Amino acid sequence: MRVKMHVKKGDTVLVASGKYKGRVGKVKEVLPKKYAVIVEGVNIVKKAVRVSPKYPQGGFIEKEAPLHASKVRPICPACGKPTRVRKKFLENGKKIRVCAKCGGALD
Amino acid sequence: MKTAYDVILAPVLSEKAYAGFAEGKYTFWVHPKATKTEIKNAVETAFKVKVVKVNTLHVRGKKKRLGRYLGKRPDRKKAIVQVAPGQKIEALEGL
Amino acid sequence: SKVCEISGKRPIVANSIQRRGKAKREGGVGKKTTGISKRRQYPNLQKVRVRVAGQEITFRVAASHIPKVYELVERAKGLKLEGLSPKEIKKELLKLL
Amino acid sequence: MKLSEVRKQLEEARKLSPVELEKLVREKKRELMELRFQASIGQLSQNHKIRDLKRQIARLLTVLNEKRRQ
RNA sequence: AGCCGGUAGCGGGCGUGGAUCCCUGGAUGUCCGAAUGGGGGAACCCGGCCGGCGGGAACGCCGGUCACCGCGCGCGCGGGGGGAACCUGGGGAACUGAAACAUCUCAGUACCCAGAGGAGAGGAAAGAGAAAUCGACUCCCUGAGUAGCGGCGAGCGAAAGGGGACCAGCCUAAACCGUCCGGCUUGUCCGGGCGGGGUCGUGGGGCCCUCGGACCGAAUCCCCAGCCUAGCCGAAGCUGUUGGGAAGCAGCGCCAGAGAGGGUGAAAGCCCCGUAGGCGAAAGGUGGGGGGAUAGGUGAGGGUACCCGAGUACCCCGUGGUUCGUGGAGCCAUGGGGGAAUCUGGGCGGACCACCGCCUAAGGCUAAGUACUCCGGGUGACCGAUAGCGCACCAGUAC
RNA sequence: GAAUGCCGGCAUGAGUAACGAUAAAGAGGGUGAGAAUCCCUCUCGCCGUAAGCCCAAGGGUUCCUACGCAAUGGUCGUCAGCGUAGGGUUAGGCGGGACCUAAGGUGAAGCCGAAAGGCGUAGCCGAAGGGCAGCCGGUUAAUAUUCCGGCCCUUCCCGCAG
RNA sequence: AAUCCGCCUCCCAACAAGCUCUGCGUGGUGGGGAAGCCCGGGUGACAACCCCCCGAAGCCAGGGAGCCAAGAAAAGCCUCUAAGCACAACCUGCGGGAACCCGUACCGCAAACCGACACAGGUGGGCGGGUGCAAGAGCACUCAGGCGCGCGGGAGAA
Ligand SMILES: [Mg+2]
Ligand SMILES: [Mg+2]
Ligand SMILES: [Mg+2]
Ligand SMILES: [Mg+2]
Ligand SMILES: [Mg+2]
Ligand SMILES: [Mg+2]
Ligand SMILES: [Mg+2]
Ligand SMILES: [Mg+2]
Ligand SMILES: [Mg+2]
Ligand SMILES: [Mg+2]
Ligand SMILES: [Mg+2]
Ligand SMILES: [Mg+2]
Ligand SMILES: [Mg+2]
Ligand SMILES: [Mg+2]
Ligand SMILES: [Mg+2]
Ligand SMILES: [Mg+2]
Ligand SMILES: [Mg+2]
Ligand SMILES: [Mg+2]
Ligand SMILES: [Mg+2]
Ligand SMILES: [Mg+2]
Ligand SMILES: [Mg+2]
Ligand SMILES: [Mg+2]
Ligand SMILES: [Mg+2]
Ligand SMILES: [Mg+2]
Ligand SMILES: [Mg+2]
Ligand SMILES: [Mg+2]
Ligand SMILES: [Mg+2]
Ligand SMILES: [Mg+2]
Ligand SMILES: [Mg+2]
Ligand SMILES: [Mg+2]
Ligand SMILES: [Mg+2]
Ligand SMILES: [Mg+2]
Ligand SMILES: [Mg+2]
Ligand SMILES: [Mg+2]
Ligand SMILES: [Mg+2]
Ligand SMILES: [Mg+2]
Ligand SMILES: [Mg+2]
Ligand SMILES: [Mg+2]
Ligand SMILES: [Mg+2]
Ligand SMILES: [Mg+2]
Ligand SMILES: [Mg+2]
Ligand SMILES: [Mg+2]
Ligand SMILES: [Mg+2]
Ligand SMILES: [Mg+2]
Ligand SMILES: [Mg+2]
Ligand SMILES: [Mg+2]
Ligand SMILES: [Mg+2]
Ligand SMILES: [Mg+2]
Ligand SMILES: [Mg+2]
Ligand SMILES: [Mg+2]
Ligand SMILES: [Mg+2]
Ligand SMILES: [Mg+2]
Ligand SMILES: [Mg+2]
Ligand SMILES: [Mg+2]
Ligand SMILES: [Mg+2]
Ligand SMILES: [Mg+2]
Ligand SMILES: [Mg+2]
Ligand SMILES: [Mg+2]
Ligand SMILES: [Mg+2]
Ligand SMILES: [Mg+2]
Ligand SMILES: [Mg+2]
Ligand SMILES: [Mg+2]
Ligand SMILES: [Mg+2]
Ligand SMILES: [Mg+2]
Ligand SMILES: [Mg+2]
Ligand SMILES: [Mg+2]
Ligand SMILES: [Mg+2]
Ligand SMILES: [Mg+2]
Ligand SMILES: [Mg+2]
Ligand SMILES: [Mg+2]
Ligand SMILES: [Mg+2]
Ligand SMILES: [Mg+2]
Ligand SMILES: [Mg+2]
């Protein structure tokens, strides 16, 4: 019905696996069809660009490479620890993500 | 619901269509099912003119391809209205 | 050939069996079948014309149910039948079955 | 068109009468033709306007139908 | 919490004032197609009537309406066409087997046709068949390759009974009573509609005397539980190291009603999706379960001898069905001829007769247990791109 | 490991036969990375009851223009009926329909047939037959009895007059 | 039903006419218009546009004769009357308005159709110029127009 994403633009995530394991960053973008997130300054790649109006002088640019969403963990804004996410029902009763270490909202 | 704006789709843009403005002949793409009589009325209520003569012709879609995939463009009909001596359709005088 | 409008009797298919030889009961060796082929047995259909309500109604009916046509005519008296078409009379008549 | 503009359109339309609804579709069907003509000579950068108008008309006729249905 | 399908790009937009998306309902839905105004070489053409638009009478467009058949007093209702298998009914081969072939077989199969429906058929004894018995029908096991049938060749092949699945029984016709309508050969008439009555095999019912004067309950209807059509919550891991990458190795932990499985840069219970265990419907659908209502249901002697399904039974001729191929050939069915009776009537128990029994024909309906798999899901000592569907791919396509 | 097996791939024959009418070519100039093969000119040859022109079938964009040459072209290719794109088909009078009937088809009535279905006066359908009003010229890259010009004409509606 | 058509009789007309329809000529007017020469276009040009001959298988046409094998229908159209209606309606003349749908490109004896091919095959109708040869749609050459057939270059055996 919808892909399940445990993370979103632009909560702050720990990158827990791959070359960039350990890095922290904002999620610039979420790409659910590809099940992937773009994290700021994580997974940089050198792309060639043709000499073009958009890029005269040509050469290369840096781009952020998407990460498989499972590599990423939201950092709790209360305790500052990376966490699994839980759902808690409020009184509304809207539902929200809360850190699984303490109980803090993650938004 | 059916309005004149349903019958006249777009103006025909080409050397040949433009060549007609001089003698008062405006050429539109119209809906493929629309009658000379109905086009006369539609053009009259849309561009506030007096339509005096209507020429229509069918235009078959060109067969066209994209890689493996053969297809056809939509079939169209074009109409050529003659407005009364002296009138003009300014939207088309354009150019 | 066809269907009795009264009894419903239709053409049926029957075998025609050809036999040879002397029956056992007559001291023969027994009967041998020398052919079986399908054939049809038709109802004995005939036309019965009847006047009912000053109209001429006609039935295609197996001879066995020829009397059932006239019996229908009798039951017809209790009916408001005049002015009707002969298609219409026959329908009413038939409905009485 | 913005979601709130859409509600707004519906509320307003629903207040209208059939005749007023008809008048307004005709006006919009007219406004679409202009858009078309502009789109065809390459002078409509704001092309989302076409999908928009088309749905407005749909919403309107939809509502016209509502009224006349009972 | 992203989004404007596959689908990126140009060019523009939308979304926590809740978008995209998912489910339900609704609206719109050109033309063709049963196709149904009429025509026609399907997807085009041409009309009638009413209303509307345009300056509108000619012309054109928009809305509505107009086929035929059946049933019921022009109007109502219904039909028509499709559906992969399954089902019934009406028709119905041949190769082949018989080591040739005709009867026989293949086979009442293949196939054509009609019809249904989520099933269909059958079904409440004129049964079975030997028991002083059983008790509708259907379906499975068995009985049994028995009994039998059979150029007594090749081959074909029951049923009762027993064990199971499911379980349910009803409505009429007639006698007689009432009512409306119609007929001409005037009523104690005949006939047709409708209502009442009645429904059975210890025979039952009708009518006439006598006596007696609440319970059951649907297969119809109503409500509801439950189910389907979207979903949702869901425990526990960090560090070091090799490495492009850890989930490998190492250290120290932890969860478990969850160590099914799939992903994640390699090999992860604890990262992700899940899993166990739970939760969830405003709307539509279902609802065989629960509840309620309604229709409907129910006596005993005695007398009378009115009724108890007709071109029927019955007999003969021609055939089919059955295991039964003419056989000692009954039974069930019926194309032809003849042709009854109403319980002191009738059919049956394998020619026939007697005796002794069984059963009540010629009107109708009836859940469930059964068949199938287009569709959804689960699961494989199933395939893994020459396999597996013809098709993993834009295939019933190219050709 | 064999089934003139099946499917696929790749060899051999072989740089071989052939390159599809023996109407026939030559040169100069241009273009281009490239030219016997494309454009232009001159010369030569062939058809001319056709090998020219116009209609109908069938075909379905193949037409015209621009940009192209991987493949398609029996060679080459700068060219093309090829690739990409853009343009192009204009009718009261031509053809067909809103007219008629032909064979035949279909078919109220009606007849027949196990089912499916088969017939069938009327009627309806059915044409390259009947009926019916447009000629000459100009114009486009590409349409013209269609546009334009000139001169003519048909039917329908309404009205006026007789 | 009919005043029409058919049939009978009479009168006038008759290889006439008249009336009517068509072909052709003319006809207000509108158009075209060569070679050659300059770069499809300009010019030639105020182009000229006249006379004679030949002459159809085409037209007048529904013409004529002969023959035997004896040669569509229906509508349009004219006429007759019926229900009707006769302020209607129909005819004639004039005037104003109205006049829909589909086709139309291109190939079309062929490299675009039928032949798996840009295939020496097959494909209905019309036009098909000039000269000479008795004639002709034959034959030769040739106009308009269109082509040299989508491998070539050499060599000069069997
Ligand atoms: Mg969720
Ligand atoms: Mg680290
Ligand atoms: Mg909510
Ligand atoms: Mg609409
Ligand atoms: Mg031009
Ligand atoms: Mg057209
Ligand atoms: Mg046209
Ligand atoms: Mg398309
Ligand atoms: Mg016989
Ligand atoms: Mg015997
Ligand atoms: Mg003996
Ligand atoms: Mg025998
Ligand atoms: Mg008789
Ligand atoms: Mg009989
Ligand atoms: Mg008899
Ligand atoms: Mg919306
Ligand atoms: Mg898109
Ligand atoms: Mg953009
Ligand atoms: Mg964008
Ligand atoms: Mg909500
Ligand atoms: Mg929906
Ligand atoms: Mg439309
Ligand atoms: Mg339709
Ligand atoms: Mg139709
Ligand atoms: Mg029809
Ligand atoms: Mg009207
Ligand atoms: Mg007007
Ligand atoms: Mg009007
Ligand atoms: Mg209109
Ligand atoms: Mg209409
Ligand atoms: Mg209509
Ligand atoms: Mg049917
Ligand atoms: Mg059906
Ligand atoms: Mg059968
Ligand atoms: Mg039948
Ligand atoms: Mg049979
Ligand atoms: Mg059968
Ligand atoms: Mg046969
Ligand atoms: Mg045989
Ligand atoms: Mg066999
Ligand atoms: Mg055998
Ligand atoms: Mg044999
Ligand atoms: Mg044999
Ligand atoms: Mg033999
Ligand atoms: Mg045999
Ligand atoms: Mg066999
Ligand atoms: Mg058999
Ligand atoms: Mg089968
Ligand atoms: Mg059916
Ligand atoms: Mg079932
Ligand atoms: Mg059932
Ligand atoms: Mg049933
Ligand atoms: Mg019973
Ligand atoms: Mg045994
Ligand atoms: Mg034996
Ligand atoms: Mg058998
Ligand atoms: Mg038996
Ligand atoms: Mg049993
Ligand atoms: Mg049992
Ligand atoms: Mg069971
Ligand atoms: Mg009676
Ligand atoms: Mg009575
Ligand atoms: Mg009565
Ligand atoms: Mg009794
Ligand atoms: Mg019941
Ligand atoms: Mg979860
Ligand atoms: Mg979890
Ligand atoms: Mg490292
Ligand atoms: Mg690690
Ligand atoms: Mg470890
Ligand atoms: Mg488990
Ligand atoms: Mg596992
Ligand atoms: Mg796993």
Ligand SMILES: [Mg+2]
């Ligand atoms: Mg890797």
Ligand SMILES: [Mg+2]
């Ligand atoms: Mg492991």
Ligand SMILES: [Mg+2]
């Ligand atoms: Mg493993």
Ligand SMILES: [Mg+2]
């Ligand atoms: Mg795992």
Ligand SMILES: [Mg+2]
């Ligand atoms: Mg569960």
Ligand SMILES: [Mg+2]
């Ligand atoms: Mg669960």
Ligand SMILES: [Mg+2]
């Ligand atoms: Mg009693």
Ligand SMILES: [Mg+2]
């Ligand atoms: Mg009695």
Ligand SMILES: [Mg+2]
């Ligand atoms: Mg009985």
Ligand SMILES: [Mg+2]
């Ligand atoms: Mg009876």
Ligand SMILES: [Mg+2]
């Ligand atoms: Mg018999």
Ligand SMILES: [Mg+2]
């Ligand atoms: Mg038999």
Ligand SMILES: [Mg+2]
């Ligand atoms: Mg015997």
Ligand SMILES: [Mg+2]
């Ligand atoms: Mg027997």
Ligand SMILES: [Mg+2]
């Ligand atoms: Mg009989």
Ligand SMILES: [Mg+2]
């Ligand atoms: Mg008895």
